[PDB]
Design a protein around this ligand. Sequence first.
Ligand SMILES: [Ca+2]
Ligand SMILES: [Ca+2]
Ligand SMILES: [Ca+2]
Ligand SMILES: [Ca+2]
Ligand SMILES: [Ca+2]
Ligand SMILES: [Ca+2]
Ligand SMILES: [Ca+2]
Ligand SMILES: [Ca+2]
Ligand SMILES: [Ca+2]
Ligand SMILES: [Ca+2]
Lengths: 5, 5, 628, 628
Amino acid sequence: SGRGK
Amino acid sequence: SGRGK
Amino acid sequence: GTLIRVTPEQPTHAVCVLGTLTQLDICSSAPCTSFSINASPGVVVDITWPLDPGVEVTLTMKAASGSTGDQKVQISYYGPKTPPVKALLYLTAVEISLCADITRTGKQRTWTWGPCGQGAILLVNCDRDNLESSAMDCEDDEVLDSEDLQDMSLMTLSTKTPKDFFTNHTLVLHVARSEMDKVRVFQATCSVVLGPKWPSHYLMVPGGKHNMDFYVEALAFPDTDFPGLITLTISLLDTSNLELPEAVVFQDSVVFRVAPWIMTPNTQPPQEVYACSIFENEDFLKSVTTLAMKAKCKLTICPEEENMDDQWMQDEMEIGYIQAPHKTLPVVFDSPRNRGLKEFPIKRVMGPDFGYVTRGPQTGGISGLDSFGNLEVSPPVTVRGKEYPLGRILFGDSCYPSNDSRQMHQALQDFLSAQQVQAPVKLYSDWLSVGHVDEFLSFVPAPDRKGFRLLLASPRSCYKLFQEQQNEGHGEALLFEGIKKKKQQKIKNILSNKTLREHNSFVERCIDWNRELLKRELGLAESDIIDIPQLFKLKEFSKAEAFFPNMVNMLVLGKHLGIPKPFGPVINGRCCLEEKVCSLLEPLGLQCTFINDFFTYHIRHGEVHAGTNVRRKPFSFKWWNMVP
Amino acid sequence: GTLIRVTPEQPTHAVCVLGTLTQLDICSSAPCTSFSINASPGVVVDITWPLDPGVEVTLTMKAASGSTGDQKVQISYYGPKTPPVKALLYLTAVEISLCADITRTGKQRTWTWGPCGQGAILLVNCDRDNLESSAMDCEDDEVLDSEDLQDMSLMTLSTKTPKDFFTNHTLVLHVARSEMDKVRVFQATCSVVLGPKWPSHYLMVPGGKHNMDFYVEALAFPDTDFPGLITLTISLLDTSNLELPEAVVFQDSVVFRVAPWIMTPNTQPPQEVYACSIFENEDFLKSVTTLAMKAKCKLTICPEEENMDDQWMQDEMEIGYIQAPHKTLPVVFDSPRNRGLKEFPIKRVMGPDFGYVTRGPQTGGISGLDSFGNLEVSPPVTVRGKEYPLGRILFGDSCYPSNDSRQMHQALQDFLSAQQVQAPVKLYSDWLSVGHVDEFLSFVPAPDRKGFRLLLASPRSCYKLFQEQQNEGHGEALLFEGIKKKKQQKIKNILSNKTLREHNSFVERCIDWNRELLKRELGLAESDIIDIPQLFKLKEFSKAEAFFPNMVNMLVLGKHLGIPKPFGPVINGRCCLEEKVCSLLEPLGLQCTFINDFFTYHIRHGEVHAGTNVRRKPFSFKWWNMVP
Ligand SMILES: [Ca+2]
Ligand SMILES: [Ca+2]
Ligand SMILES: [Ca+2]
Ligand SMILES: [Ca+2]
Ligand SMILES: [Ca+2]
Ligand SMILES: [Ca+2]
Ligand SMILES: [Ca+2]
Ligand SMILES: [Ca+2]
Ligand SMILES: [Ca+2]
Ligand SMILES: [Ca+2]
């Protein structure tokens, strides 16, 4: 999972 | 008119 | 504060905004044990030096650059056997000043209270200079009248830069999003630059010297959700690099405080009287007209076609004011009462240099304690050391919340406390049928000690008067002499009435509770207080109404009082109540007129104060010089 | 304060609550030029006297009455030729004391901050001692567990009265309606007496000596709508007269302040580590496990079946605490982020002696800056004189609001500022793609000067290191040695890259803006700060991401650091980045472990701090002793 989005 | 009501 | 890092590898270019602390990092990229600094005459290097990081090197520019990089700094790094390696720094100085009236006369990013404090003031633009319009001026995003600008606060941006400076830099004016809904800013050449859902604006500024004027209006009074502070910030941005985001080089700001809504006590000189006594009365209205003239007051009167038979001009509104160094105007607080007078404050009172506010639910959910005969203020007062130079708002409540008790709506109470310069005091008025503080108290001016008297209704005093009359042979004297349709009552049977005495002992006890409460919360001594003889009766729900016209519910027009005619026992060709009152007040140089309000007001449960309202002169003392 | 009026006409009966000022009006009903007072031994008359109103006559009772009227006062009025006319007063003394822990150890109606201040503390009852339940303890109107009472504040009513006293008097406990929704009060024999839509309760109290215990829970944290103060009042009522309303004789109260939610810096000793590294990693998880053991920490881990592939344990929560003299407990602030970890704080963290709060909209309307890697606090700090003994909350923002900018939601910001003991500071983090302060700063402990170092990411430092390496012959050394799937890159081509250098100059400038900002707002000197070599790159929207694993985004477990393995140029059998970092931190007695987070965390835009979370020991210093 991307931290930001 | 009544002041209170 | 800025740290510039210098490098023998590369020349450095940098802007220096005047009045700012700029320093050099000379160690981080140094090649060599010692260094020397040599700068052009417009740079003051404050600080043949060892190359140790503890060396504070600070640069100051004397004045704005005329061209980019026109000032310069040379750092020569040298060592025990190494020829000197120099590092270059090219500087451009600019003046960037956001100004406002922070000394509170006429034009630390922190707003402080008091005579030695700092911070500019903002008015809520709640009047209506726009001719033939319904809405307050601050409701649109336009300046529609040149005189509207008088209400607004001036803010100016002075810049002094090279002619080419904004080729590579941009200025943006902004407000936090949290605050954008409470302010609007106009750019004067007016067009809006900042406001609701418009939190930033890029400014178009030419190089050289320029001055850009802004006009700021507030859109909201301080309140439980809003301490009352608005910050506007100017940011300078480096827009030099097409392949990079803008970079903030400098921020400066001004903090405004929104002006509180302030009430005026009966001790402030009256300017204008209101009645809406266009209904079946007329001699009532004649009497208040004479007083208004004696008092040198404008007189405003509301027709029955507008009244809707609502005669209680005291109750839908309270005329206060807002005050800034540049502008002071009266402002109507419109009670949510919403009765026959509902349209009067919005249609007849608000207008050019007459502001407007309202609070509370407008479709019901209200009580009698939201009628503004329940809303008063004390004269100025100092209390165990704490000074209250605009007085303390006073309003009526119950002693504790029950299923049967009443209070003024929380929205109103919260608004009043958020105004913070007349720190409200809750009084106990719920024991009255109507429920208002104006039924048991009044303030009047006086030439001595503190400049006023507190008047309080007093059954004790009336029992004393009547007893004294009976002791001197007048027990046959008739209360309610003069009246068309009334049961005359003899002093002797009034005194002998044990239930009446019980009721008035209970009322006395309610009034005394507030006596002591006002003593504590206003720093009053007995010598500040005059008891007005007054009898009450309990009726539905054991709630208190006036037995004869409630004389403390008077109209105070300077030394001229409009007092409800009690129609008391006539003794030596004179009502002894009138007599007593005159003996109590005339030694203060007050002039007592007794106005027949009997069938028109009294028997509908209010008196002269209740049927009228007064606009009074704002305090000379500036609210911002208080330390609440 | 009470004024009793005495009368030769009638005896007076009156109650006197001990610790109260009672006075006599002897003039108002006097018959006679002089008076004398004679009282029973339990009355102290403080004051053969002239009958002038300026005479202060004050009565004090030594102790509670054993029977009604058992004390007495005789006022003899006498004159030049008149036999003495006496007036009677019958007194009943009672003790009525509402007590609470106002010295803040263990049991003026005003709450004051500081070591010499006064006022009891109330905790929000936001944990869940109730076994097998979902809801916080303060959500119902019941005390369901005896240990729940440990969270609650004790308040006691001590009364000492005659056996027959409450025949004719009643006591009522109340809270303002404005505050009833924020508090609940239980009567201990527990059953609720006060709370939401229950603002008053009549108490059943026997005469003689009695002591009634209450337990108070708060239901709401201080916030923009709620300064944090709750007042509970006891009123004594005279219910003597069947034909009359109750009459308040006496009120007393206690003011509680609701305890703020407080964060803990990386300098507070760690108690428990969280990861939710049950997903495809495992050696990451092994490494943090070793650190946790080295640090003597409980270790809590969230399974992929609960995670929902959400590995960012830093971001949904922040473990803080609340603290009262009787009770301190950790409390989870649950970010509205609401991603795969959404259920973790509410299902796994909240529980017995683990509180819960959340703020913000829960169904979207959110940004990346609401993820709690954007929420940190500094160590304790003193700043130009103002002391911040719990540190200052730090969080990331933009430099001004644009259509493209981000901020943490106002509801969160407002909650944090309303906690008032870690006065938040806005930093600039929006220039980062992810947007969090944990991407460019960290605090670590240190044995000297102020007890910590501020660590800041530093492109400057990495350029210096790489240059030095190349100066000494290593320009062929490869960044990203060790990696499965990565383009190796030579020091020389990294240095020669002009665009990379441009990007990192822009980032440097963003980081330096915060350097100076933290200097100002925390009172830091350069000597408090260590630069960590770190390179960045700009990507979509020119937003900054880490070029190699972001080492400042570390896990701080006391002297034990969990640092993302940068996989830097290997020189003398060693990554020179690791080397540099160790040389910078080991002299503070910190132990650096380099954890491979590369394919698991780094390439998904976060590192070791971002993938973990820590519960730390509350400050010893009591928040209430601060003067914010
Ligand atoms: Ca307008
Ligand atoms: Ca206007
Ligand atoms: Ca209205
Ligand atoms: Ca105007
Ligand atoms: Ca009024
Ligand atoms: Ca409960
Ligand atoms: Ca609990
Ligand atoms: Ca959540
Ligand atoms: Ca507990
Ligand atoms: Ca965090």
